[PDB]
C-alpha cells in the first residue's frame, strides 16, 4: 500500500 509509489509505473 503506497502512497509513495504513485501512478501506473
Amino acid at each position, epitope marked *: *500500500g*503506497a*502512497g*509513495n*509509489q*504513485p*501512478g*501506473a509505473n
Partner: antibody
Amino acid sequence: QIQLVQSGPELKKPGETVKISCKASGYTFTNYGMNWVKQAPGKGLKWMGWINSNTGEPTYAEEFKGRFAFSLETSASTAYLQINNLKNEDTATYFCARWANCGCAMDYWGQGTTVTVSS
Amino acid sequence: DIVMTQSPSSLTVTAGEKVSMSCKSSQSLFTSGKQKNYLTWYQQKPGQPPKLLIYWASTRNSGLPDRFTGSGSGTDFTLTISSVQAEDLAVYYCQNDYSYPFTFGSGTKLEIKR
C-alpha cells in the same frame, strides 16, 4: 480526522524567499507522499511536483525546477515548500495534497497558502 | 507530456437536471496490470481547496452523494451529475495519474440557471 494544516498567507517583495509549511495529522506520515499544487488567481490547477515521505527525494515538474524546493521534517510530520527569487507570476495560492493509498489520486488537501508578491 | 483536455469549458443548468462533462487524454491511462484507469476527478467550490470526487475513473470517494458518477476508459472519460443541486456550483477538474508529470485539465465550470 486526517488533516493537513498549512501555514498562513505571506507577503513578499520581488526577489525574496518564502517557506510554506504543511503539517499533517491523523495518519502515518511516512506512508504517503506530498504533492504541491499551484493556483494563480482566477486560473486552474497546476501540479508542481511531489516529495516522497519515506525517501525524501523530490520530483519537480519542468516549469518548477530551479527556483522551487520541497523539504521534509519527519519528526514534525511536516512538508515544506520553498520559493526562491520571487516574481509576480508566483502570486498564487499553493496547496499541499497527500497522495492517496491507491497511488492514483490526491486524497486530502490543505486549505492553501496565499503568497502575494508586491513592493 | 500528457495533455488533458476538458469539455465544455463552462455550462449552465437549472437545478434538478442531468449534466455530463468530458475529459480526454493525450496518452491512454488504462493499465491492464491492475485493470484500472488512472484518472481522477476533483471538485473545487469557490474559495475552497479541491475536493476529491472520483478516483480510478469510476470509484466514488467515501461519503460522496450518489448523484455523482464517473465513467469512461482509456483516453475518453465522463463525469455525470444526475440531478444538480444549488451546492453543486463548482469547477470540476480531471487529473492524469498515469505518468509524470501528473497533469490537470483546464476544468469545466458548472453554473446554475435560476
